[PDB]
Structure 1
Amino acid sequence: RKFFVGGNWKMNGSKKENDKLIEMLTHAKIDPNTEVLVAPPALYLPSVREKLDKRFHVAAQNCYKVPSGAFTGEVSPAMLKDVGCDWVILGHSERRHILLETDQLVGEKTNHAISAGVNVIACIGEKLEEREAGKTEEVCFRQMEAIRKNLSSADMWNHIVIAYEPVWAKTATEQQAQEVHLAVRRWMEEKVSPAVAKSIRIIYGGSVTAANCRTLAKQPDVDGFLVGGASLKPDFIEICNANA
């Protein structure tokens, strides 16, 4: 499985700061076997995609579940493709828990994006009370099932990267991350197919820093990262190189 590192800029960006990050990525020494993605705020997606070499993916941080219509404030996968973007992050913990997105909506968006030619980083993860009640697997499997049930065909998994976010984190160890990634992969093996489970990337979306990335990368079922704050700093390059 090809190592996959996505930098989620979250609600951070400006012409000035984006220029700095683009120059950092353009001149950086990055392991050629790492797939690298960045996700700027929607306003800046067309410009970042125009300015970055195709070696880098550029992802939206959200999209909706139909190509057009009366949905003020929403953007569709067709618009992403229009501006050269072929990736989207869906179901991020902030969208589920702050902006109130349901499991079903994330699954509907995922199916629609892939149908429109956009690959999906599909995010899952449990909150603190859920982990403490022993429901990590119950919650993660429920979120995964809502995606599985909404896909139009089993080949769509070739266009998904699963991101596990330990929302509950209190600090998640590399052992705790590996434990969930393994459980999710075994779920994929049973509910989809061994072939998909073996090939699908499951990336870790907890706190990823220059200091902990190499230990996390060595876990056998951790295939990369969905990076938060470090994506805005030169440490992102070290994280991109965590598997090398």
Structure 2
Amino acid sequence: APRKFFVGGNWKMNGDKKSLGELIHTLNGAKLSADTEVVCGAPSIYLDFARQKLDAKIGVAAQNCYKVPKGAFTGEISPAMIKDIGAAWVILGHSERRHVFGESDELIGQKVAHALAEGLGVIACIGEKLDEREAGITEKVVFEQTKAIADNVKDWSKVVLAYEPVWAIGTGLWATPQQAQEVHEKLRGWLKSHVSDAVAQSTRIIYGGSVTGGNCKELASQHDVDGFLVGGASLKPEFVDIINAKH
């Protein structure tokens, strides 16, 4: 009945074998809550390395992939390759790929469908920007993005939604736990009416804003926040505290 708490740690473009080696060794020896499903999002070049060194209980995620198994797409990797090195997840639709690299809702949706058909789990990301949040069209934007994902999801048991308050990234604005709860609650209500009641009750909607050891207990105590997609703090030893945010 209860959704399993889910902390993913998006490392982004960071680290080398030495620094990521020390990070992994710290997670391996740390007292982690058995209630939490932990997943580390490693750079593509370090996905094989991260899987070898990390304990089997902690999952590994690609930070991005493409929509077909093979082909003339220099620079890209496919779900077939991510599966081949032992990883079981992929992060798609991150705000950074949307913004810096112009990834459309259509393109993200194709990636979601393919990743899922190949047997990977997907951490799908959504979120509205500053001018959108200020305009009061938060719901219209995240529902548009969630629909572009959901049209390509037949089975929700391998999917986790991640809300990114992009409006509070790099601008003077900040997100409160109450504001996060209000978006998560509306996303769950969207899944209830557009997919099914059971999908809404079992699907983890994790918060992907600024999550630190100092603010995670309050964000996790929110009814409809089922975990985090942690940015910068996933590289530090306090990522352990964030995993244990309910204890």
Whether the TM-score (by the shorter chain) exceeds 0.5 is yes
1:238 and 2:238 aligned: no
Q: Identify the residue that residue 114 of structure 1 maps to in structure 2.
A: 116
Distance of 2:52 and 2:150 partners within structure 1: 33
Q: Which digits, 9 at most, give the CA deviation of each residue in 1:185-242, with x for residues without a partner?
A: 0000000000000000000000001111000000000000000000000110000000
Instruction: Find the counterpart in structure 2 of residue 211 from structure 1.
Output: 214
Match of 1:177 among 173, 176, 180: 180
Question: CA separation in 2, counterparts of 1:37 and 1:147?
Answer: 21
CA offsets 1:72-97 (integer angstroms, 9 cap, x no match): 11100000000001100000000001
1:73 aligned residue: 75
How far apart are 1:47 and its partner, in Å? 0.8
Amino acid at match of 2:118: A
- The TM-score with structure 2 as length reference comes to 0.97
Question: Quick check: 2:163–2:206 contact (8 Å CA) kept in 1?
Answer: yes
Q: In the aligned structure 1, how far is the partner of 2:188 from the partner of 2:87?
A: 28
**1:29-178 equivalences in 2 (<5 Å):** 29-151=31-153, 153=154, 156-169=155-168, 170-178=173-181
Distance (Å, rounded) in 2 between the aligned partners of 1:136 and 1:188 = 16
Residue 198 in structure 1 maps to residue 201 in structure 2: yes
Which stretches in structure 2 are left out of the alignment for 5+ residues?
none
Percent of pairs identical after alignment?
A: 63
Residue aligned with 1:39, SS = strand
Shift of 1:50: 0.8
Whole-Å separation in 1 of the counterparts to 2:76 and 2:114: 14
Q: Distance in 2 between matches of 1:43 and 1:220?
A: 37
Alignment partner for residue 20 of structure 1, among 5, 19, 22? 22
User: Post-superposition shift, 1:149?
Assistant: 1.8
Distance 1:148 1:212 in 2: 30
User: Counterpart in 1 of 2:10?
Assistant: 8
DSSP 3-state at the match of 2:87: coil
Residue type matched to 2:232 in 1?
G
Deviation at 1:39, TM superposition (A): 0.7
- Structure 2 counterpart of 1:143, which letter? Q
Q: Of the candidates 173, 189, 194, which is equivalent to residue 186 of structure 1?
A: 189
Cα root mean square deviation, aligned: 0.6
**Distance of 1:129 and 1:78 partners within structure 2:** 38
- Report the Cα offset of residue 13 of structure 1: 1.8
Structure 1: tracts of 5 or more residues without a match = none
Aligned partner of residue 91 in structure 2, secondary structure: strand
Q: Matched residue pairs, number? A: 241
3-state SS, counterpart of residue 168 of structure 1: helix
* Residues 51 and 87, structure 2, Cα contact 8 Å, conserved in 1: yes
What SS does the aligned partner of 2:228 have? Answer: strand
Q: Is the 8 A contact 1:6 1:38 kept in 2?
A: yes
Contact 2:25 2:54 in 1 (8 A): no
State the shift of 1:105 in Å: 0.8
